[PDB]
Each structure stands twice: as structure tokens, then as C-alpha cells.
Design a protein around this ligand. Structure first.
Ligand SMILES: OC[C@H]1O[C@H](O[C@@H]2[C@H](O)[C@@H](O[C@@H]3[C@@H](O[C@H]4[C@@H](O)[C@H](O)[C@@H](CO)O[C@@H]4O)O[C@H](CO)[C@@H](O)[C@@H]3O)O[C@H](CO)[C@H]2O)[C@H](O)[C@@H](O)[C@@H]1O
Ligand SMILES: [Ca+2]
Length: 248
């Protein structure tokens, strides 16, 4: 049995609003809307959270029953679709410990892990993998290129209790190594371990909005995340491109 710490597919209309909390740290955060977009694999399945306002900060998050990854594997997975042809805007998630106030979450709130694609002009086309360690948020020393097209892509981070990690895009490995080698933490066997995870958050800036996020999964099972990804992103992809191609 895989431990399913968090799953979000937005399959039940407006009920997501009971699961996700808007921060009030700023009064002028942009709004997320539930949408499948202009083109999609399936109208119902491909509903997800869409940024709806240009040049805005975004702060929305969802709690789950707290857990620690000590002694086990951690997998964070979601899909990102920059349907708008983005110029500049984030597409990454943050995982927060139990202490976070969801009503006051912002860019500088303390987080454990930040993972996902970031785009800001041609210079920044990066997959972030950031670990909080000894009071610092440490960025991976490797260049992982993010996808920049209009289509749905799957992002997966795997963190294992032997201090190894793996990044997959579209369910295929793009980067791999050990935590000791690929970040400047600098023989600590417990770097990977955090005492709690309790909230997943979207803390973004976007110029051109319209990004859609879907199919969030936090789990301890690599094989399951891979299956879920094929059942999810893997079914979206071909039908989505078909519909877009139809659209001259
Ligand atoms: O990038 C590592 C960093 O990420 C997290 O913090 C994010 C930043 O605080 C910021 O993201 C940047 C923002 O940049 C632009 C705009 O706001 C600036 O004023 C402008 C001036 O140079 O440049 C950009 O236009 O957005 C872009 C697009 O996503 C990012 O690439 C920039 O990094 O704001 C976001 C949203 O609040 C933060 O998530 C982590 O919190 C931090 O620890 C980490 O080091
Ligand atoms: Ca969905």
C-alpha cells in the first residue's frame, strides 16, 4: 500500500474551495479559477487551477495531515500547463512544515522544499530544486531546463532516505544524483529528512497569466507516482495536442 499524503485532481466542481486557502498577507493577490482552458484532453479531467490575472502575485495553499519523510521516500508530483505562451511566471510548489499560517502565507514564509519550473524571459528556463538546510534555502547546483510550450507537462521530484534524488519531466528522468554532491550543504546522512510536511503552496509571480496546475500528488511510493502520472498526464497529452492542432 502506497501512503497517499495528498492528492488533488479537482474532479468535483467547486468543492476545491474547501480544500484550498487564499492568503490575505497582501490585499491584491491574483485569483485562481478552476478551468480546463481553451484546449484540453478531456473537459472534466483537465480542470485545474488557472492563474486568471496578469502581473500578479499568487498565494494559495492546501493542508494535509502532517508527516515526516524520515526513513522513507518522498515524492512530489504535479502537472503545469502554460497555455498562455508565458513570458515570465513561476510554475513551482513549496512544501511547508506544520507551523505555517495559511492565511498569512507569502514568498518569504519558511518552507522545507521548493520544486518546479520557473520561467522569466529566455535567460531563466529552470527547474528549481531547493532544500532548506541550516537556516538557508539551498538551490541545486545543476541546470535542469524547464518546458516552455503551451502543453501539459508532468513534474516529479523523488527524495530517498539514502540522500539520493531524482527529477522527472513527463515521467522520464532528466536529473539524478546525491544531495551531498549537487547542493552545497557541505557526512550528514539526515539532509533529506524533515520533521514535518503539512501544507503544499502555490507562491508565484506571473506577467502573462493563464497557467493551469493539476494532478497534485505527495506520496512515499515512486512506482505509484509513476503509475498515477501515466493515468493522469499520460492520458491528457495526446488528446490535448489533437484539440490544439484542430484549432488551426
Ligand atoms: O528564485 C529562487 C527563490 O524563489 C522563491 O522566491 C520567489 C521570489 O521571491 C520572486 O520570484 C522572482 C520574480 O521575479 C521578478 C519580479 O518580481 C521582479 O521584481 C523582477 C526584478 O528583477 O524580476 C522578475 O520579473 O518572479 C520570477 C518569475 O517567476 C522569478 O523567476 C523570480 O525569482 O517571487 C516569487 C513569488 O513570490 C517567489 O516564489 C523562494 O521563496 C526563495 O527562497 C528562492 O531563493
Ligand atoms: Ca483535473
Amino acid at each position: 500500500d502506497p501512503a497517499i499524503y495528498f492528492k488533488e485532481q479537482f474532479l468535483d466542481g467547486d468543492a476545491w474551495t474547501n480544500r484550498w486557502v487564499e492568503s490575505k498577507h497582501k490585499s491584491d493577490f491574483g485569483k485562481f479559477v478552476l478551468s480546463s482552458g481553451k484546449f484540453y484532453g478531456d473537459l472534466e479531467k483537465d480542470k485545474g487551477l488557472q492563474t486568471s490575472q496578469d502581473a500578479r502575485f499568487y498565494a494559495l495553499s492546501a493542508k494535509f495531515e502532517p508527516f515526516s519523510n524520515k526513513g522513507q521516500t518522498l515524492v512530489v508530483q504535479f502537472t503545469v500547463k502554460h497555455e498562455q505562451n508565458i513570458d515570465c511566471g513561476g510554475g513551482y510548489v513549496k512544501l511547508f512544515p506544520s507551523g505555517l499560517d495559511q492565511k498569512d502565507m507569502h514568498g518569504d514564509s519558511e518552507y522545507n522544499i521548493m520544486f518546479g519550473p520557473d520561467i522569466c524571459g529566455p535567460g531563466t528556463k529552470k527547474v528549481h530544486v531547493i532544500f532548506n538546510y541550516k537556516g538557508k534555502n539551498v538551490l541545486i547546483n545543476k541546470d535542469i531546463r524547464s518546458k516552455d510550450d503551451e502543453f501539459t507537462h508532468l513534474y516529479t521530484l523523488i527524495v530517498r532516505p539514502d540522500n539520493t534524488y531524482e527529477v522527472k519531466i513527463d515521467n522520464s528522468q532528466v536529473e539524478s544524483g546525491s544531495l551531498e554532491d549537487d547542493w552545497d550543504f557541505l557526512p550528514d546522512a539526515n539532509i533529506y529528512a524533515y520533521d514535518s510536511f503539512a501544507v503544499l503552496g502555490l507562491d508565484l509571480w506571473q506577467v502573462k497569466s493563464g497557467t493551469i496546475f493539476d494532478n497534485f500528488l505527495i506520496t512515499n511510493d515512486e512506482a505509484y507516482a509513476e503509475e498515477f502520472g501515466n493515468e493522469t498526464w499520460g492520458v491528457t497529452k495526446a488528446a490535448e495536442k489533437q484539440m490544439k492542432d484542430k484549432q488551426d
